[PDB]
């Protein structure tokens, strides 16, 4: 999966 | 899946 | 799935 | 599914 | 499903 | 409180 | 409170 | 509190 | 608190 | 606190 986490 | 989390 | 979470 | 959650 | 939740 | 539950 | 329940 | 639960 | 739970 | 949980 793709995770862009801030 | 795709997760863009802020 | 797609999750855009703020 | 698609989740846009604010 | 599609969930746009505010 | 605010509860949006699916 | 506010409850939106599905 | 705020609860958005899927 | 804020809870966005999937 | 803030909890975004998948």
From Swiss-Prot, chains A, B, C, D, E, F, G, H, I, J:
<protein>
    <recommendedName>
        <fullName>Heterogeneous nuclear ribonucleoproteins A2/B1</fullName>
    </recommendedName>
</protein>
<comment type="subunit">
    <text>Homodimer; dimerization is required for nucleocytoplasmic translocation. Identified in the spliceosome C complex. Identified in a IGF2BP1-dependent mRNP granule complex containing untranslated mRNAs. Interacts with IGF2BP1. Interacts with C9orf72. Interacts with DGCR8. Interacts with TARDBP. Interacts with CKAP5. Interacts with TBK1. Interacts with STING1. Interacts with SRC. Interacts with PPIA/CYPA. Interacts (via C-terminus) with FAM76B; the interaction results in retention of HNRNPA2B1 in the nucleus and inhibition of the NF-kappa-B-mediated inflammatory pathway.</text>
</comment>
<comment type="function">
    <text>Heterogeneous nuclear ribonucleoprotein (hnRNP) that associates with nascent pre-mRNAs, packaging them into hnRNP particles. The hnRNP particle arrangement on nascent hnRNA is non-random and sequence-dependent and serves to condense and stabilize the transcripts and minimize tangling and knotting. Packaging plays a role in various processes such as transcription, pre-mRNA processing, RNA nuclear export, subcellular location, mRNA translation and stability of mature mRNAs. Forms hnRNP particles with at least 20 other different hnRNP and heterogeneous nuclear RNA in the nucleus.</text>
</comment>
<comment type="function">
    <text>(Microbial infection) Involved in the transport of HIV-1 genomic RNA out of the nucleus, to the microtubule organizing center (MTOC), and then from the MTOC to the cytoplasm: acts by specifically recognizing and binding the A2RE (21 nucleotide hnRNP A2 response element) sequence motifs present on HIV-1 genomic RNA, and promotes its transport.</text>
</comment>
């Amino acid at each position: 999966g793709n995770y862009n986490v801030f």
